[PDB]
C-alpha cells in the first residue's frame, strides 16, 4: 500500500505539476525504497511532456540511489 | 568565598602583609564567625592546631570564639559587643550595620530556638543576657528583618517557632527558585520574538 499510494498520486496531481515535487519532499527520501520509487514514478507520470525544472532537479538525486 | 580561600595558613612572610600573623588570625576568626555557626566547624577550624595556639596567644579572642562554640549567650553577647567595638577600630568595617553582630546573633538565635519549640521570652532573656524587653525588641526587629523563623505570642509572651520539616523547607526553596527561573524564562521569552 505504501509503494502504491506514493506512485499513483501523479494521476490526480498532474493538474498541479508545480505541486508534484512539493508533495513528495518526504516520499522521495523516505526510509522505504519502495516509497521513494513510488514518488519517482508519480512525478514521472504527472509530468508527461512538461519541462518542470523542479521535478527533474528533485529526481536527479534518485537517479543514483543505492537501491536498485 | 573569603573563608574558603582564606583558612590557608601558608603565609608569604612570618609577620607581614596583613600587619601580623595575629591580625591574619583575627581576620580568619571574624570571617569564619560571619561564615557559619556550629556544624563540624570543630573539625574545620577548632581542630586547627595553629588555630588553638593563636587562641592561646589571644585569650579574649579565644574567649568569644569558645563562647560561640559553647553557645553560652551570657558571655557571648558581651564578647560580641567587644568584637564589634574592635571591628570599629578597624578599617575593615564595611558591614557597619549588617554583619558585625546582627548576622552572628541571627545565626546564634537560629541555633538556639531550633531544637526548641516554645522557649519563654523571660527565661531566654536571662539565658541570653538581661533586659527581657531588650531581647523582645531584638527578636521583633530580626523577625521583621526576615530570619529567626518563629512568631511571638505577646499576650502570653512566648516564642512559638515555625521550623519547616526538611521536606517543607526544601519545598519552599524549590518554589522560590522556580519563581526566580520563571522570571528568567519570561525574560528569555522577551528575548525571543523581537
Amino acid at each position: 500500500v505504501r509503494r502504491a499510494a506514493v506512485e499513483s498520486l501523479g494521476f490526480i496531481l498532474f493538474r498541479t505539476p508545480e505541486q508534484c515535487p512539493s508533495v513528495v519532499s518526504l516520499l522521495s527520501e523516505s526510509y522505504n525504497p519502495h516509497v521513494r520509487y513510488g514518488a519517482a514514478m508519480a512525478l514521472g507520470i504527472c509530468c508527461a511532456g512538461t519541462g518542470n525544472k523542479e521535478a527533474i532537479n528533485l529526481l536527479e538525486p534518485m537517479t543514483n540511489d543505492p537501491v536498485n | 568565598q573569603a573563608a574558603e580561600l582564606f583558612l590557608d595558613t601558608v603565609s608569604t612572610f612570618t609577620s607581614y602583609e596583613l600587619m601580623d600573623y595575629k591580625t591574619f588570625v583575627t581576620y580568619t576568626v571574624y570571617v569564619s564567625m560571619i561564615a557559619l555557626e556550629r556544624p563540624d566547624l570543630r573539625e574545620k577550624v577548632i581542630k586547627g592546631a595553629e588555630i588553638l595556639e593563636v587562641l592561646h596567644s589571644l585569650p579574649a579572642v579565644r574567649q568569644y570564639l569558645f563562647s560561640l562554640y559553647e553557645c553560652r549567650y551570657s558571655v557571648f553577647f558581651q564578647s560580641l559587643a567587644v568584637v564589634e567595638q574592635e571591628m570599629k577600630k578597624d578599617w575593615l568595617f564595611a558591614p557597619h550595620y549588617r554583619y558585625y553582630v546582627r548576622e552572628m546573633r541571627i545565626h546564634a538565635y537560629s541555633q538556639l530556638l531550633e531544637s526548641y519549640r516554645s522557649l519563654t521570652l523571660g527565661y531566654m532573656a536571662e539565658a541570653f543576657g538581661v533586659g527581657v524587653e531588650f531581647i523582645d525588641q531584638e527578636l521583633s526587629r530580626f523577625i521583621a528583618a526576615g530570619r529567626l523563623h518563629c512568631k511571638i505570642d505577646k499576650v502570653n509572651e512566648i516564642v512559638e517557632t515555625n521550623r519547616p520539616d526538611s521536606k517543607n523547607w526544601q519545598y519552599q526553596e524549590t518554589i522560590k527558585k522556580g519563581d526566580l527561573l520563571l522570571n528568567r524564562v519570561q525574560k528569555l521569552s522577551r528575548v525571543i520574538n523581537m
Binding site: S25, L26, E29, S30, Y31 | -
Partner: protein, 37 residues
C-alpha cells in the same frame, strides 16, 4: 481582489507552517534511515 489577498495570506501562513513540517519529517526519516543503517 482583497479577499484574494486574505486567502493569499492564509496560504502564506500554511506554507510557512508546512516548511518546517516537511523538514522535520524529512530529517526524522533520515534519522530512521541512519538507525536502520
Amino acid at each position: 481582489q482583497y479577499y484574494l489577498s486574505k486567502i493569499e495570506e492564509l496560504q502564506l501562513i500554511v506554507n510557512d507552517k508546512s516548511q518546517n513540517l516537511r523538514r522535520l519529517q524529512a530529517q526524522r526519516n533520515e534519522l530512521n534511515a541512519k538507525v536502520r543503517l
